[PDB]
Each structure stands twice: as structure tokens, then as C-alpha cells.
Design a binder for this molecule. Structure first.
Ligand SMILES: [Zn+2]
Length: 29
């Protein structure tokens, strides 16, 4: 169940993983 970040281009194994990660780029809230 591979995931990809559409912000840097890093991969993950879970959707929750991907999310936690991506929110370190903008991490709005
Ligand atoms: Zn990223």
C-alpha cells in the first residue's frame, strides 16, 4: 500500500504516514 508525497517526492507505507509527513512542508495548522 505505497504512498507518495506530492510536495517533495518521498514515499510512505500508510496514508496516515504520508499525511503526518507532508504536513511538515506547510503544516498550516
Ligand atoms: Zn514531502
Amino acid at each position: 500500500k505505497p504512498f507518495q508525497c506530492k510536495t517533495c517526492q518521498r514515499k510512505f507505507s500508510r496514508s496516515d504516514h504520508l499525511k503526518t509527513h507532508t504536513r511538515t512542508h506547510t503544516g498550516e495548522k
